[PDB]
Each structure stands twice: as C-alpha cells, then as structure tokens.
Design a protein around this ligand. Sequence first.
Ligand SMILES: Nc1ncnc2c1ncn2[C@@H]1O[C@H](COP(=O)(O)OP(=O)(O)OP(=O)(O)O)[C@@H](O)[C@H]1O
Ligand SMILES: Nc1ncnc2c1ncn2[C@@H]1O[C@H](COP(=O)(O)OP(=O)(O)OP(=O)(O)O)[C@@H](O)[C@H]1O
Ligand SMILES: [Mg+2]
Ligand SMILES: [Mg+2]
Ligand SMILES: [Zn+2]
Ligand SMILES: [Zn+2]
Lengths: 651, 140, 643
Amino acid sequence: VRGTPVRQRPDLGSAQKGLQVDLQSKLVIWGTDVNVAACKENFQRFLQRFIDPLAKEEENVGIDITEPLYMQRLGEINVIGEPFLNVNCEHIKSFDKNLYRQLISYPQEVIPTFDMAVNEIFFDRYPDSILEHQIQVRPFNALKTKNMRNLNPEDIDQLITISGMVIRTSQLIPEMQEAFFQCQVCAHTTRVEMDRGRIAEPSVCGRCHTTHSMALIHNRSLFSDKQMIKLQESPEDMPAGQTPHTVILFAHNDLVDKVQPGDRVNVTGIYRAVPIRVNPRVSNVKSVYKTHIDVIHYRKTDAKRLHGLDEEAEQKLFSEKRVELLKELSRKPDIYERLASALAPSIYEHEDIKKGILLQLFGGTRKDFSHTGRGKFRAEINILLCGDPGTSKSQLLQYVYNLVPRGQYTSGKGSSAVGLTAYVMKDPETRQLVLQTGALVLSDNGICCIDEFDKMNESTRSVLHEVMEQQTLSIAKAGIICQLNARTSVLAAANPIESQWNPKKTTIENIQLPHTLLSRFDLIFLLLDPQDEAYDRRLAHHLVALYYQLDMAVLKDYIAYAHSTIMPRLSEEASQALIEAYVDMRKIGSSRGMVSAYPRQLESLIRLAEAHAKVRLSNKVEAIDVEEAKRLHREALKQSATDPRTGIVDI
Amino acid sequence: SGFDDPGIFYSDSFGGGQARKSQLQRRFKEFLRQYRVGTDRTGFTFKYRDELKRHYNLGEYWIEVEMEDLASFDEDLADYLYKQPAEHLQLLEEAAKEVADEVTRPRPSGEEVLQDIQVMLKSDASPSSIRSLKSDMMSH
Amino acid sequence: LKDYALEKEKVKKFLQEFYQDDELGKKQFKYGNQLVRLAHREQVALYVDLDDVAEDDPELVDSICENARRYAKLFADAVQELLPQYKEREVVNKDVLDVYIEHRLMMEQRSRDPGMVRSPQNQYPAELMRRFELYFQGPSSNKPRVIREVRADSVGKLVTVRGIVTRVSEVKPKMVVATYTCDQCGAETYQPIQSPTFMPLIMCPSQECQTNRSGGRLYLQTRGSRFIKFQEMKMQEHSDQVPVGNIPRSITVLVEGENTRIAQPGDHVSVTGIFLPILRTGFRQVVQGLLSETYLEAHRIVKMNKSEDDESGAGELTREELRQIAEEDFYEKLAASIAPEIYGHEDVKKALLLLLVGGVDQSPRGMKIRGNINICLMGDPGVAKSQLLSYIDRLAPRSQYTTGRGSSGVGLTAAVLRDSVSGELTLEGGALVLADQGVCCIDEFDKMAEADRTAIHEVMEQQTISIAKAGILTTLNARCSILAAANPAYGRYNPRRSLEQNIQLPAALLSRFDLLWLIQDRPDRDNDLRLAQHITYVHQHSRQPPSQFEPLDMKLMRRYIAMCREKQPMVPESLADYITAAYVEMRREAWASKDATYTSARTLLAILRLSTALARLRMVDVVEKEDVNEAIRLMEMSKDSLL
Ligand SMILES: Nc1ncnc2c1ncn2[C@@H]1O[C@H](COP(=O)(O)OP(=O)(O)OP(=O)(O)O)[C@@H](O)[C@H]1O
Ligand SMILES: Nc1ncnc2c1ncn2[C@@H]1O[C@H](COP(=O)(O)OP(=O)(O)OP(=O)(O)O)[C@@H](O)[C@H]1O
Ligand SMILES: [Mg+2]
Ligand SMILES: [Mg+2]
Ligand SMILES: [Zn+2]
Ligand SMILES: [Zn+2]
C-alpha cells in the first residue's frame, strides 16, 4: 500500500462477517480452512518465484526463465496504468495445490488476500508508482466445469470456469457504492458506504441534531457499473436429452461492455445462488433459489478457434520471432496451397473449395467510401456450395462453424426472418421487454453458415439480400427503428433442384435460385459428382483410413497478422487486369443458361484478389492476385466444362 | 408443506469505551463467583458463591450484595449501579441466576426449573436526607 | 395414539440387528454397514427397504405406510443418533458444508456447560447438520396405484405410482435452513424452511443481542445455509390404465437430494413417495376452506420396463448369457426375437437389430461421422411396418414413436415453455430430443410436413437441430437414429414405374438412409398360407407359433444389445481394399442399371457402419470380412423385392 485507494470489488459480492475462529481449545475464517496470514504468504511465495517450465510462446514479455512470470506482469502493471493481475489458476495448482483448492472453494475470502499480497509486493518496489487504485487480482482458468447442469448446491459461492456464446448484454446499471446525505436544515453532509449490501441512513445529523433530517442525494453519491449478460453455455459434456442452457452473468466496473453478443468467451466467476421474490413488491422469497455467475475474468482465447477481433487489434499479439516466422512462410511459393490444405484436413481434395474458404477467412480490404457518397462496400466474401448430396458440404460448413469466432449455423426451415434479424422478448429477470438479435447479427463480424439454403422459404431468404449487399439490417418495426450491423460472410450450401444434379438441365435451371440472389455470392462452387471410378477408389481409401488412424497455431497467427497489418491496395496493372477480366467474364457468362456476370462480379473479383494478396502478406494487389481470382471464379461454376449452349459433363 | 412452521433457532455467540451490557453482566458474574473474603491464615471463602448456594438450597432465591464489596472488586460496576440502577440491577440479578444455577447444579428432581434470584443490596454509606431528594437524584 | 420414543427404539433395533445373506451368502448387517459408510460420509442416501422391516415387524410397516412422514423423521432421528457409535475414524472433510458442521460442533463443545439447560431455540436444527438423507422403498405387498386414484384419502400415506415422465425441471438449490449472521453479536440464526416461500428474518434473536437490547439486524447468507438439490417433475398415467374416453392424468413429483438426475422426460418410472399437500393459501379463493395442491414427495425413483437402469451396471450375469453370446447363431437368434408375432421379414429384423446396436461414431480431426444406422421401411399396405416400428419403440431404451402429424413441428423439435420453479422460459424438447441417443420411429414418413422433413435432414446428418426462430435461438442436440416407415408413391408399389418414381424421396433424403428396404407383398399360395397360419396361431393363442429357438424376452434383448453397445470395434487396414472394392463395385452397378437409387460416399459409410455394428454383435474388437459380407448382403436384400 502506498496510500493508493483500495476500490471495492462488486464481483466478490457484499462482504461477509469474516469471523476468525481458533481451532484449539490456527486462526481460520469461520466456516473455511483459510487463515489470511498463511494464504497471503503462500501467494507472495507464488508471485515471487513461479516459472512455467513448459510454456514458451505468446508471452511477448515473459522471459519465462526469469524467476517471476508474474512479477514481470507486475512490471507491466507499472508501465501501463491498469491495476489488474490475471493469474492462471493452473499456475497456482502447479505451485501450491492446497492454495488452489482454497481459492476455488472460498474465493470471497481468498481473493482479497491475494489482492493484499499483490499490492504489498508491487509497492515494495515501484514505490513511487501512481495507480488510480490498488491492484485487483483476477484468477482465471480454474478447472473447467464441463457441464454447468452438473453443478450442485455444494458448489454455491465457489469459483468456476465455463464457456459459451454471449447472447445479450444489458445496458449499464448503476450500483450504489457510497451514499451522500445532506440535512434539510443545516446542509451538513455525510457519506455512508455499502456495508453487506445496505446503507444505514444517518437518522440524526451530527451538526444540528435534528432527527431524520438527512436526505439521500443520489447524484452526489458514488456508483459502480453493472451489466447483465445472457450467455448460452457450450458444454463439453452433453448427456442424452439435455437442451441448451442459458446462464446469467453479471459483470462489474471494468468487465462491463467487455464482450459483445455472438462472442465466444471463457468466463471465470463465482457461482451465486440468489433468492427470488414472489412479487416485485413484497419481501417474501421462494425456497428455490436461482443462480448466476459473478464474472471475475473473461478469457477470449481458444486454442481451436481463430483470433477474435479484440485480440487481433491488440498490438502485442506476436513476438518478433513469430512475425519473422510468419513472413518467412509468406515468402514460400505455395503458401496459398499450404494454408488451404490446412483447412478441414479430414476432407478429401476439395482444393478449390478450401482455397475459397481460406480467402473467405482472410477477406477483402475494408474500405472507407464515406466521402464518395457511395455507401458501404462489402469486403466480405460470400461462398455458395451447390452440389448433389453426400459431397461433404455440411462437413465444410461445420468445419468453418467450429473454427471461426463469431459464427452461426443455420439449416433449412429452422430459421425465420425475425429469428435471423431481431425480435422483442421480455427479460424474465427485469420483467422488461428487451431486444434480442438473431443469427445474422450474432455473426456481424463473422461467418454465417446457412445449410440447406435451397430448402428455405423465400420469406427468410429475402432477409439475406440486404445483409449480402449493404452489410446492414434496417428494421422498421412497431416502435423500434434502427440499422443493425450485419457485416457477415455467408457460407451457404444448397442442393440443386431435384436434389441431384441432372445433366440434361443447364446450370441456371439446376441451381434454381433467384438470379439477383446468385449475384450476391462471389463464388458458386458446383460440388458435382463425376461418375469416376478412380475418384471413387481414392475417396474410399481416405474414408476407410479415417476409421482406424501445417499446424493450426501458425495458421491462426498467420491469419491474425494478415488481418492486423495487411491492407492490400490495387496497383495500376492489377487495375487493368481487372478491367479486362470483367469484360471477358461478361462475354462468357452472357451465354444461354450460365450464371451471368453483372457489375457486381467485378467487385467479386476485386474482393478475391485483395484477399489473395492478403494471403501473400502483400499489401499491394498485383496481376497474380487477379489471375487467381479469375481462376477461382472459373473453376467454381465449372466454366471450362460448360459449353455456351447447355450444361456440363465431367472432369 | 405450507402448513407448519418450525421455530427460529440460534447458536451461542461464538466469535467477537462504553462496555456492552453483556460484558457488564459477565463482570457481575465474575464478581459473584470470584469475590473472596478472608485471609489465607483464617482461610478464604467466596462470599457470594456460597451465599447463593446456601440460600438457593434452602429455597430462598435472594442474596444481599454489599456495595463496597462490588466497589472494591470492580469499581466501574458499582458506579454503574449507582448512576443507572435500573438496567444494571437487571444485569446483576441475571448474573446471580446464572451463578446459582452453576453452584446448585444438579438439582433434585422437582427442583428442575431454575429460579429467579432477587439481589437485595446494601451499603455502609451514611443515608442522605429525605429533604435532599431533589430532582437531580431521579432514577439514581 | 402411539408413543414415538418406543417407535424410535423399534427402528433403532431394526437398523442395528437386521441381517441378510446378500454378500455372496455371507451374513451381513444390511443397515449397520451403511451406518458405517454414512458415518464416514462415504454415502448420503439410505434406502430403507420396507420389505426388510416387514420381516420382523409388519405392524411397523403398517404404521409407516399410514403416516410415512412421521416415520421418515423418526428414521432420520434414529440413524442420526446411531451414527456416532458407528464411526470408526475421522471424516476427511470432503466438502465445504462439512467445515461448517465441524466448526459448529466444535464451538458447541467449547461453550458446552453440559449441566446447563439451554433454550429450545438455542440449538442447531437437526436438518442443518445431517449430511445424509433417508428414503423408503415401498413394501412389495403394496400394489402400485394409478395416478388418477391417488386422492385425498391417501394424503400422508406412502404410495407407489408408475407413469411416463413428461417434464423435469433443472436441478436447482432449494433452501432447507436459511442461515443468518448478525451485525452485532457473532451468533448464527437458523430458519428451517417448510413452506414454498419464506419471509427472511430481520432482527437477531441471540442471547447477546437480547441482553444488550441492541439493534442486531441479521443478514441472510448462502454460505452457511443448507440447500438441497431440488427438482420438480411431471409424471403421467400410462396409456393402458386410463379410463375409456379420457386423457392421461399428471401428478407433480417433487424430487430432492440424491433422487435428482434420475428421471429424464420420456422415461417410464415407478415412484415411491408420500402424497402430500401444499397449502395453496393466497389466492382469491372462491370457496372457504383450506384447499391445497398435491404432490408426491419422491422417495424411490426406479426407471423401468423400457428404460431399466440397474441391469446396465449389472452386466455380469449367468454363465448362460456367456454361452449364448459366445454362440455363432447369436445374431440370428437376436434378429428372430424382434417382434416374433410378425411372420417373415427375417432380413428386415436383422437390419433392425443393426439399427438398435448401431455403429461406432468417428471423430477424426474435427469432422464427425455418426455411427447411427437410419432405416426406412418403404412398403406396401399391411406388411407390418407399423408393428415393427411399435415393437422397436417398446424395445429400445430411449425411443420415441411418431406418426404423421400429431407430433409435427415443435412436437419433434424443441419449444420454449414457461416453468414454475423460476417462472422463466425453459426449452422443452420434442420427439427428436426425447430420443436424443436412441431411436425415433417416424411412421407415415411420406405424409410428413416439409418443414419436418427438412429438420430430419439436418438431424440425420449433422445430429443437431438448428432453430433460429423468435423465442428460440439454439442448436439442439439430436443424436438419434431414424427408423422410418413409408408407403410408395401411390400407396402401393407400381412395377410399371421406376424405382425412384415409386420411392418419392429426393436423392438427399434417400441417401440419408443407410438401409432403405422395399417391402412388396406379391400374392402366392404357399407363402400366403404360411403367413395365414402364423397369424391365426397368434390370434388363437396370443403367442407366435413355437419354433426351434425360444425368442428372447425383451429384457434379455435390451441387456444383450446394451452389452454389445460398449464394444467399439476398429476396421483394420487388411480390410481397406476389400471394402473399397465392394463400394466401387456397388457404385458401378448403380449407374450401370436404369432402376437404381442415388448412391454416394454415404453408401460407403453405410457399409462401414453396418459392418461395424455386425462386428459389435459378435463382441469382437476388430471388424472381419464376414461382417462386411453381411453388410453387403443386407444392402442387396434391401432392394431384393424388385426382382
Ligand atoms: N470429399 C470428401 N471428403 C471427406 N469426406 C467426404 C467427402 N465426400 C463425402 N464425405 C463424407 O460423406 C458424408 C457426406 O455428408 P455431408 O453432410 O458432409 O454432405 P452434404 O453435401 O451436406 O449432403 P447434402 O447435400 O445431402 O446435405 C460426410 O460424412 C463426409 O465425411
Ligand atoms: N408379416 C406379418 N406378420 C404378422 N402380422 C402381420 C404381417 N403383416 C401384416 N400383419 C398384420 O396386419 C396388421 C396391419 O399391419 P400394419 O398396420 O403394421 O401395416 P402397415 O405396414 O403399417 O401398413 P401401412 O403402410 O398401411 O401403414 C397388423 O395387425 C399386423 O398384425
Ligand atoms: Mg448437408
Ligand atoms: Mg402403418
Ligand atoms: Zn442538520
Ligand atoms: Zn446479534
């Protein structure tokens, strides 16, 4: 302590009695097995000398041999102003297993001890540092609770980690922390802090001794931020017949507005049980309590996903060694093919679909057309997979769904128009009507996978027009009028009319989608079945070999680096290549029953070329990028196998 | 299920300038248990402990407390009794009930319920005039 | 009328010296051993079988079954008094509640004053410091009652009912004793909760705060309080015990403690418990009087008769079942035991057994292939498709049966519905969720709504249900195998039209089915006479005609199938070429012909999971070539009727 303010922690709840009990007729807290002194000293021992002996990557500061991992973090807290220490509970588990057991079991008593220990260590050195408040420790990565339905009343008030997707976040709620009073008579003022969740009103002023003359003045009081979050849990254990679960989270002061709807997050917090009133206007409570998490920490990183937008925007996400390795990869002649092949490794030789999906994961160049009157340009790549069944479209959509952050999966008739855009429900915790987003807004900066695109009625497929053209969702409903953001990539899979490609019908007759809607997709991959025996044999071997027996982290970091730093711009010779390509492709597609080209396919080419240049870490779009855009656009739609009169045959 | 109601239960108060009345009552209990009269030559006896024992076993349920004994053992308690007799005599009598309980324990059946003890009190101070009972002496 | 001190001595005597030869003939004290186990906190639930009590005190069993809540309390008192003398070591304090119990006990000892008589309120409530929970197992001499007929004359009595579970809440904490601390004293205050609601206390009653006449406001806290796992289910009358023109009646079962998480919706269960009232005060009651709701306070919940449980953990059995499983014709015997009253359809029954056993789910580098076999019986009128489906429903552990459009829409998928314990919007699953890891029998598949056919697409391949409608935005989880029954395009197979023009399924849905079986009944004198003799014997004797092998009881079939289920076999490399060649040959003959269904990689995957199921039925850990041969042969027999 340096006289630095020790701000209260609403995430730990209201303080308890904190009675000290001696177990001899040593001085544990009543009902616990922790004494504050030994817990504090254990944690200091942990902070001073803990080294991860197995982890060397993604530190960017961590010397990871230097005796503290965490006092390096304290040094960072000195360099930056933020007074928060995120302690990985697995580290505590390694160092002191009993301390870990105590932490997850009595967090409300152990975490404040951790706070005192951290501030003692920090202000031992850095004794002239200035912090807007003392350091607050945030333990994360506790032993993951796989299914939150498995939690018992034995687990109430313990520290748990869960994962799921943020569904709704409330508006910020002001929570009182210190009340302000004035006497209506003498104008003498006093302040009263929250004590166990209530304020004791002064009831006599100490100046003019008038009974009940001090009045609470709300806007001179001190408040804290609170936010309710609906999180749809993503359990790793899914017992038979169990429906999906929504858990209430409450974030406080600084974790408020830290996650947006559609974000996948690991949340560490305290499992709380709270009483329900029988009416809002009485004080009787039910015998059966309801539960929520008081959020302690948000972890956005996931090993199996790509980096989220919050991570990619973080300046120190890569070490210099990592950036050099990524750039060295970008100099490889076939980095495009390597990265494409790293996608869906269990799917057999759909190399062009995988290249298109890679370009979709990279995306085109975000542009600010705001001074041009034009509007907003869609930098997202929309792919449609049309092909006869059994050709692994749903597997590709499932792979992309399970790989990106901010993704959604929709199939067929299970979605409606208002279920994709937005609707009003009544929050059953506030008794208030709140607006909930649908699938197309929850993937606002991600990929929406629409499966069985064709088996999906035109009512809900009209919603896609504005999303795919203008990246916005204008809703003019009864009272609420706004323009939701829907900057999604669309990965759609559909069957032909008659559910199987028949060769007697032209491509347009056989896809059978409105011809204005097909122009919104910038790749239409025709996943057709050649009646080919060699391919049968090779696929059969892949599939059977699948019944007995490039990295991801590098792919993840490569894509994150490309999104962070690379903003490809068209070169003059790329400009000319695009002009010629559009004119040629428009000549080609003007044939009988082929998918025609509109001025929108020129922008499709631009997006694909920019994405491909971004794969090279190029920062400059060149003729090779436009050439690959043309080639990908032609290979999808099988325009080499298409005659200008009729359908296609086989490759 | 919505028919019965059990009681409200509580525990002993395990854990935890102007002393609270519980503490004053405890000091009164200590005074009654531990106020010793006599000398090691003639022996020591605990005056009020065995007086409570004798009176209770006879069925008396009262004791006589000298205010100088209390003043010597605990001068603050005697000051409380003089200034605010009403509440501190309630404390002292409750203390006497407890001490009598723990010196007659156990009691023959029929005498199972513990009795209230009246604490009469005396002093050696010279009496004041009945004419001196002015208004400043009210509630003392 | 009766003296409960003597009853407590009676139940103590029962608990201490009742013995049985259960342990392999060795004579054990059945309940003393458990008193040991739950004195060391290694057990929570003590199920007091009332058949054991009846062996030596049937009058006690009568008293128990007549009050049943006095006696649950008596038994808890008696066991709580017996626990200290059965404790042979010191509990390791596995829990957090245990620490509170230990601290409270130690403080009580510390300030004991053994001879001083403390107030009746100055004590720990019994329920606060138990950690065990005691339940009755109904006497078998009590015949189970019907939910409709459990009425006011059985309030307070122990009854046993059976029905389908329709609805179970989530497990959530029910306050049993609310603990408070004071801001002045340091004593704890306890408020045992009996009602469904309670008013939290405001002022503390402890001795110190009464002596001091202090404010002493008390604060309700979850940390010292007692919660119990609570769960509310709705259970429904079985169909064959409803009056004639009626609908089935429900009963609310309040499940708490260790009986939670047993029943799931869709389960057939037998519940033993006390029929009890809830005062129902508060309303603008039309009628004067103390009217109340009712519920069954569950004591024993037993899944049964299709969702039997204990056999699963009792896989060890007689030497017999060893010898039949070892036999080579075991697969034929299990197939023949499927609906023995239906004559013929031997290969159909073999395929159905494969659907029951299922293949092995693969999870290679994040690209899931499901081991479920989906079968469609595309047949003529009156060829026993519905009878086979209804049988498979009665057989499989988690099976839902769906006809045309009674269970359409959210009757297959989920819906959001209001609850009662929390009053919010819970998600309830339909047939595809109630059959999440079992079979969903879709009768009249061809006359199904197009929205439901689309949902079935996504279920059959991705094994989920994606809903993005207004109230609901979830991906449900539906790992079921679809047994469908349908008629050809015009209700009867027309040999003058093409095979797919008769099936009337699109290529995508037709490929969703691992085995699609055509069942035509061409008349012929011999086979029709044999079918008629079988059917007329079944009518005459209510049984199938005797054959060489007696068909297995449906319990044995369930146990054999379940014992097969945990037998994941691997396809070896030595079969890779054989399987690939079979698939290629099948694929080539599919387009060589002009009367063939759509064929794809799913055809390979069907071979592969069918052969895995066949390997699993032989309890082997690798697939052999005979399994692949049988898979191929079933795949041809599926369309053999065309010839
Ligand atoms: N080229 C391939 N690579 C890997 N797996 C394949 C390939 N082709 C087919 N499969 C396998 O066959 C199955 C195809 O089902 P999937 O749902 O992926 O196809 P689909 O195109 O969605 O079919 P539909 O058009 O009927 O929806 C999957 O299990 C997949 O693993
Ligand atoms: N092979 C058979 N063995 C025994 N009984 C049979 C057989 N075929 C038909 N039946 C009898 O015929 C009756 C009708 O059978 P069911 O209702 O199952 O026909 P279905 O296949 O459902 O026809 P639909 O396609 O019209 O629904 C049943 O009572 C059944 O007992
Ligand atoms: Mg699909
Ligand atoms: Mg039928
Ligand atoms: Zn004043
Ligand atoms: Zn108190």
